[PDB]
Design a protein around this ligand. Structure first.
Ligand SMILES: OC[C@H]1O[C@@H](O[C@H]2[C@H](O)[C@H](O)[C@H](O[C@H]3[C@H](O)[C@H](O)[C@H](O[C@H]4[C@H](O)[C@H](O)[C@H](O)O[C@@H]4CO)O[C@@H]3CO)O[C@@H]2CO)[C@@H](O)[C@@H](O)[C@@H]1O
Length: 368
């Protein structure tokens, strides 16, 4: 095969920030190389952490700039979207003072206006954060059908003049034309293997090399309503929570990928919990279990039980446990909402309790 590497540049965008980081590296300054994304970012399905695309991109920094000391920050969580991204950014990413940030959610986000709005939220938050990090957008692709959410994420790239590289216009063209058999690079047509992770990294480092061998724009108003830029996770540390059957999980979290932590568990019908959550948007995080059967809960917003949403922890997929996030209220009134979660169905043979991870309250941050 030969990849057309130039087809990787989905957007050139403004290189001011990224070149400024390269200049700091040349000056021997310590730099923080971060990655925020889904399963591919975390490192699925590499044989070792060191062979995932993120670590490859990190080694590119090390090798190209030996005079600088680089820190690797992998904030990937499998089976999660930019909606979770924007809520966890502060804890998992911005609190480690990133200088380079790759955002990788283009095969986790659906290509819908909802995720254009959450992705914008995420992008605005990260770009205007304290360390003013260089942001590169990375668009993976589904190798079964050539799909991604790049239509929605691209619009945001061009809006903020962010660089963006895509595997949809580099790797997938090779695969669809027969020049690459799928199983050489991915066992399941989504997650790269060792070869695939090296290939994905190579499309990124091509761009990075191009930048090296070669002041930032006005900050635009948001393209969308942008009502997720301020996303607050309410977990088992929040006061204002009153448990009625739900008990807080006090167990220690090994890393961010140990994602059923800092929340609450319940086992008995009628077990409930109430939260005060401020925002115009309300979303809820819970476990969908591969181990069946499991409880079913409903979530009620502002006492409106007639229009409650079913949270079924009986996963209908078989790959593993999912950290689900459902949007329950969107573009409501911005205020403190009452949120209740209660178990509506249980089974004598339930293999796991219901795990409520978080409830997220979201609203816009004012543009100036
Ligand atoms: O949502 C869009 C798309 O998603 C599809 O489901 C994906 C899901 O998005 C996610 O990428 C998931 O990743 C899994 C992966 O397949 C393995 O199960 C992986 O495993 C790891 C395990 O959890 C341990 O950490 C172990 O130590 O290491 C393993 C990796 O070596 O876990 C990942 C989650 O972190 O894969 C599924 C399916 O591919 C589908 O829902 C599809 O319909 C949809 O369009």
């Amino acid at each position: 095969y030969q990849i057309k590497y130039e087809n990787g540049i989905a957007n050139r965008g403004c290189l001011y920030r990224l070149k400024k980081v390269m200049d700091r590296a040349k000056a021997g300054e310590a730099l923080n190389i971060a990655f925020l994304g889904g399963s591919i970012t975390q490192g699925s399905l590499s044989s070792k952490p060191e062979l995932c695309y993120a670590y490859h991109v990190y080694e590119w920094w090390k090798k190209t700039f030996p005079q600088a000391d680089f820190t690797y920050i992998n904030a990937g969580i499998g089976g999660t979207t930019s909606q979770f991204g924007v809520a966890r950014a502060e804890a998992d990413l911005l609190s480690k003072e990133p200088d380079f940030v790759i955002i990788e959610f283009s095969v986790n986000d659906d290509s819908t206006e909802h995720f254009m709005e959450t992705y914008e939220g995420l992008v605005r938050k990260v770009y205007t954060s304290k360390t003013k990090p260089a942001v590169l957008l990375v668009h993976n692709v589904f190798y079964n059908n050539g799909a991604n959410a790049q239509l929605m994420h691209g619009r945001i790239a061009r809006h903020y003049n962010l660089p963006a590289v895509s595997m949809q216009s580099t790797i997938y063209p090779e695969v669809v034309a027969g020049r690459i058999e799928n199983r050489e690079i991915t066992p399941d047509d989504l997650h790269p293997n060792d070869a695939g992770h090296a290939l994905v990294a190579s499309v990124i480092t091509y761009f990075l090399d191009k930048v090296k061998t070669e002041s930032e724009p006005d900050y635009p108003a948001p393209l969308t309503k942008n009502t997720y830029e301020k996303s607050i996770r309410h977990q088992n540390s929040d006061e204002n929570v009153v448990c009625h059957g739900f008990v807080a999980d006090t167990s220690a979290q090994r890393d961010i990928t140990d994602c059923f932590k800092h929340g609450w568990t319940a086992s008995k019908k009628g077990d409930s919990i109430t939260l005060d959550v401020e925002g115009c948007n309300i979303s809820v995080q819970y476990r969908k279990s591969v181990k069946l059967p499991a409880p079913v809960a409903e979530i009620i917003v502002d006492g409106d039980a007639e229009h409650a949403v079913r949270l079924d922890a009986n996963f209908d997929e078989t790959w593993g446990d999912k950290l689900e996030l459902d949007t329950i209220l969107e573009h409501g009134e911005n205020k403190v909402h009452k949120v209740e979660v209660r178990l509506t169905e249980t089974h004598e043979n339930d293999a796991v309790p219901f795990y409520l991870v978080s409830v997220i309250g979201s609203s816009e941050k004012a543009h100036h």
